[PDB]
Symmetry: C2
Subunit: 235 residues, 2 copies
C-alpha cells in the first residue's frame, strides 16, 4: 500500500501523471499484482504524501495519477538518534524495525566493550517498517561505529542521553521542535564504567528509563514511546 | 541472581507475595518494589507466528500485571507462555510474575470488562489516552484492548464501546500488533513514574 518515490513533490506536480521505475514496480506488478484503477499511497523524497491511482501498469513501468495531497505529517517533533552497542542474535533488526515504527530518526550501531560479537539488510528493514508505519521519511542506518568514533559524533547533536543507572523527562520536555537527540544504549552486558565516563565528559547525561531492568532491544522502544507520549500525546 | 520462590514472607529471592530479599539465609529485606503504580491488563487479539511470546516477554519487562489473549475477528488462530513470563520477570527485577490467562473468546472478553476500573480500546476512528492514565489513582485497574494483525474490527469496537471501553489512538504512526502494547506500557511508566 505505501511507497517511497524518488521524486520531489514539485517534480511529481510537474506533469499530469508520474511513473514508478525499479524495485517498486515489481512489488506493485508481480508481488501484489495490482491493476489500473487500483489505489496506493506514495510519499515523495521531501516527505509529501499522496493518494495515487494506478493509471498504467506495465512489467517495468507503473503510471500514477495523484488524486489527493493528504498533508499528513506523522514525524516525531524532534530528531531522535538511536546508538546501540552491537547486540547478539538478530536483536539489531528488531531495534531497527520497531524503532522506525516508533519514529526514530536514524540508527547508529557501534562496537561496545561488552559487545560479544548486514547493513544492506538493515536499510531494507528500515524502509519496510517505514512503509508499514506511514512514516514521511525512511530512517538512515549508519555504519558500525567504533566506540571512539561515536564519541566524536556527539558534538553534532543538541543533546545526548545515556540510558544507564531522572533527567529524561526534563531533557525531553525541554527540547524544541526540530532539535536533535542522541540516546546511547549498551549491549546485553551493558555499557562499562569506563565508557560512561567518556560519554559523560562529552556531555552525555546518564538517565534511568524506569525502575525495571530492560533488555537492549527493549530500552530504545520505551524511550521512543515516551518521547511520543510527551511531545505528541500531552503536547 | 534473582529467583521467585513460593513461600510468603549470595542471591536475591522474591516471595510469592512480592517481598524481595538478599540471601538459604535471609540477610536483608530490600524494601524495593519496582511494579507500576497501576494494574495494567494486556488484552491482545491472537497474533501469528510467535508474536504473543514477544508481547509477554517485553510487556513483563515493561510492567504488565497480566495478559489476556483472546480470539479476535481477524485472528487466524500456555505452559511456555507462563515460562516466558517468569523468566522475563526474573531478569527485569519485577516483584511479581504476571499471569497469562486462558485464551478467551471475544464474548468472554466482553463479560470480563466490568471488573476493570477503566477500559481502553487501542483504535482511532476520529486522543483521550493521556487524560485517562493521568487520572487513574494508584492501585486502580486498567484493561487495554489490542487487535491482531489487521486490527480490531469496526463491529468489535462497537461492542467494546457498548461495554464502556474508550477508543484511544497511540500516536499518529501505524504500530504493528506486537508494538502497540509496548508503547502503551512505556507511555504509562513515563506518566506515572518519570513525570510523577
Amino acid at each position: 500500500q505505501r511507497y517511497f518515490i524518488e521524486l520531489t513533490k514539485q517534480q511529481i506536480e510537474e506533469a499530469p501523471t508520474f511513473s514508478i521505475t525499479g524495485e517498486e514496480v515489481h512489488h506493485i506488478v508481480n508481488v501484489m499484482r495490482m491493476n489500473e484503477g487500483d489505489q496506493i499511497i506514495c510519499c515523495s523524497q521531501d516527505g509529501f504524501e499522496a493518494k495515487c491511482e494506478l493509471q498504467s501498469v506495465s512489467k517495468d513501468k507503473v503510471s500514477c495519477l495523484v488524486i489527493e495531497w493528504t498533508n499528513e505529517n506523522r514525524e516525531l517533533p524532534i530528531k531522535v538518534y538511536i546508538a546501540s552497542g552491537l547486540p547478539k542474535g538478530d536483536k539489531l533488526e528488531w531495534i531497527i524495525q520497531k524503532g522506525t515504527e516508533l519514529g526514530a530518526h536514524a540508527f547508529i550501531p557501534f562496537q561496545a566493550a561488552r559487545s560479544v560479537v548486514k547493513r544492506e539488510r538493515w536499510t531494507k528493514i528500515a524502509k519496510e517498517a517505514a512503509e508499514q508505519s506511514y512514516r514521511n521519511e525512511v530512517p538512515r542506518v549508519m555504519d558500525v561505529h567504533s566506540f571512539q568514533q561515536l564519541l566524536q559524533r556527539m558534538q553534532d547533536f543538541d543533546k545526548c542521553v545515556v540510558a544507564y543507572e531522572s533527567a529524561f523527562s526534563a531533557i525531553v520536555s525541554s527540547l524544541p521542535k526540530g532539535s536533535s537527540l542522541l540516546i546511547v544504549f549498551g549491549p546485553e552486558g551493558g555499557l562499562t564504567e569506563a565508557e560512561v565516563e567518556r560519554l559523560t565528559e562529552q556531555d552525555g547525561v546518564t538517565c534511568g528509563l524506569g525502575p525495571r531492568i530492560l533488555r537492549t532491544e527493549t530500552a530504545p522502544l520505551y524511550a521512543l514511546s515516551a518521547i511520543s507520549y510527551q511531545t505528541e500525546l500531552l503536547r
